[PDB]
Design a protein around this ligand. Structure first.
Ligand SMILES: [Ca+2]
Ligand SMILES: [Ca+2]
Ligand SMILES: [Ca+2]
Length: 281
């Protein structure tokens, strides 16, 4: 891409400086990203008819439309034509948070269970949300990954240990911290032994609920970046189990690139099939 926004620009290369290009060998055609969030604007122009409703566990209806913005934004980072990682992925909105972003643990669990029960082909869930400890929530996410669907999970935004947050602390999940375009850990991002890797989450431009656009920061913006490359990886290999996908995200990641990691493993999202440091050692 000749004029790529920074986050896409970053994940296709090993080192700074940025080159204003997002290169891709895949687009996640044939895979489906389940976005567990405030819903998603199916009619947004970034999706070109590739987003549909799943279910709405806040209002108990069939229309998972977004009235907050956040879930449209993360869905745009996964599969938006201009500002997305996997530009022909399928998006399925699963609405578990209200217009104000508030949700119950029961409703979020219902969305996780729904994804486990309804995923058909190559699939990946994205949970750009977090809060206090919850073994019941942890247990539902642990169960959906056991059924064969990889869950990307935001680390949290409190400059704290991600091990005290659910669902972030679930080991079998892929817990994602946030970075800026200078390769620093975003100053808000959670950290520690529960975080598997970093991805662009500071100042990310993506779709908004109103059909236009917005640029916001959070581990919620970081997470869909890696869900997006999960879909790239899944098109390349449809039969990747959660374990194999987690491994492939780990071994393809750029190493020792991030500053102020605070005891986090120093791995940065990399979207192409190269291993170690290869393309630029
Ligand atoms: Ca680039
Ligand atoms: Ca609805
Ligand atoms: Ca993990």
């Amino acid at each position: 891409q000749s004029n790529a926004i920074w986050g896409l620009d970053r994940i296709d290369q090993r080192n700074l400086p940025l080159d204003r290009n997002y290169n891709a060998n895949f687009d996640g055609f044939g895979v489906t990203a389940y976005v567990i969030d405030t819903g998603v604007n199916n009619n947004h122009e970034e999706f070109g008819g590739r987003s549909v409703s799943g279910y709405d566990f806040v209002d108990n209806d069939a229309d998972s439309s977004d009235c907050n913005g956040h879930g449209t934004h993360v869905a745009g980072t996964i599969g938006g034509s201009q500002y997305g990682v996997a530009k022909n992925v399928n998006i399925v909105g699963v609405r578990v948070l209200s217009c104000s972003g508030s949700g119950t643990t029961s409703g979020v669990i219902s969305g996780v269970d729904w994804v486990a029960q309804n995923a058909s082909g190559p699939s990946v869930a994205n949970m750009s949300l977090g809060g206090g400890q919850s073994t019941a929530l942890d247990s539902a996410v642990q169960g959906a990954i056991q059924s064969g669907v990889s869950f990307m999970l935001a680390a949290g935004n409190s400059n704290a240990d991600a091990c005290n947050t659910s669902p972030a602390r679930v080991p079998s999940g892929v817990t994602v911290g946030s970075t800026t375009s200078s390769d620093s850990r975003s100053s808000f991002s959670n950290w520690g032994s529960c975080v598997d890797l970093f991805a662009p989450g500071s100042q990310i431009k993506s779709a908004w609920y109103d059909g236009g656009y917005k640029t916001i920061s959070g581990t919620s913006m970081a997470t869909p970046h890696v869900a997006g490359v999960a879909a790239l990886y899944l098109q390349e290999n449809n039969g990747l189990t959660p374990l194999q996908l987690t491994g492939l995200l780990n071994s393809r990641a750029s190493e020792n690139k991030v500053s102020d990691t605070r005891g986090t493993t120093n791995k940065l999202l990399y979207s192409l099939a190269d291993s170690g440091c290869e393309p630029d050692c």
